Design a protein around this ligand. Structure first.
Ligand code: PLM
Ligand code: PLM
Lengths: 35, 193
């Protein structure tokens, strides 16, 4: 949730500045944890 | 209109669950004592009858026994790192800070309709909810990390009412961040045209 927030909240970066949405953030955290 | 209802409902649910967790005494099922020392009464001389109990954050109580329902006030400081941890578990600042942040969250959602042009109020709501969940995490760790400095235990529904509140709060925080993103995406399209 925090990763999603810090990545997509700012309107001065947006089309989206990155791919770190909520669904992708969960995937990133999972992959990170699972090594 | 339809995505704000889930946010409003979720914020109320999370605040309610975290106020009932902090207020109720069903955080732990231990086997200790719930009555003060019976010096003269000599009911058990000194060490009373250890029976099944249900503890919370402020009061310990007794399920079974002749004193069923008597609730003593948990004494944290008995007799640096250990002292600081005992001052954070006694005050329960983090379980109570979450409540204050969950309450502030909903206030922002309330203010998000009397001022429909200040888009920075919906962002504040989301930050309060995410931060509230963070405080819940710390509170849970602090609570668990304290009960291990003292000795067949289970967790009650008031422990899972704060754990559930964290999940609800984090999900609402996502919905309030998405609404902020959506709000700002509706002001660019118009300006592009
Ligand atoms: C004392 C509590 C600390 C933990 C919680 C802190 C949350 C602070 C949130 C403040 C509002 C953030 C958004 C402001 C937007 C703006 O006006 O630019
Ligand atoms: C611009 O400067 C807006 C105000 C910045 C606020 C910064 C603090 C936000 C929350 C970060 C800490 C959260 C802690 C959660 C557990 C207590």
């Amino acid at each position: 949730v925090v990763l999603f927030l810090v990545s997509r909240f700012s309107p001065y970066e947006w089309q989206p500045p990155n791919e770190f949405g909520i669904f992708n953030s969960l995937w990133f955290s999972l992959g990170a944890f699972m090594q | 209109g339809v995505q704000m209802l889930l946010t409003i409902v979720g914020a109320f649910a999370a605040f309610s669950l975290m106020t009932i967790a902090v207020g109720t005494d069903y955080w732990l099922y231990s086997r200790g004592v719930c009555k003060t020392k019976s010096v003269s009464e000599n009911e058990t001389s000194k060490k009373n009858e250890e029976v099944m109990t249900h503890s919370g954050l402020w009061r310990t109580c007794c399920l079974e026994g002749n004193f069923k329902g008597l609730c003593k006030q948990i004494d944290h400081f008995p007799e640096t790192a250990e002292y600081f941890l005992r001052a954070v578990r006694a005050s329960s600042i983090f379980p109570i800070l979450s409540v204050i942040l969950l309450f502030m969250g909903g206030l922002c959602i309330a203010a998000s309709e009397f001022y429909k042009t200040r888009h920075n109020i919906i962002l504040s709501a989301g930050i309060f909810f995410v931060s509230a969940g963070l405080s819940n995490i710390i509170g849970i760790i602090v609570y668990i990390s304290a009960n291990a400095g003292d000795p067949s235990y289970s967790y009650g529904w008031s422990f899972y009412f704060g754990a559930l509140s964290f999940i609800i709060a984090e999900m609402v925080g996502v919905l309030a961040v998405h609404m902020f993103i959506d709000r700002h995406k509706q002001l660019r399209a118009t300006a592009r045209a």
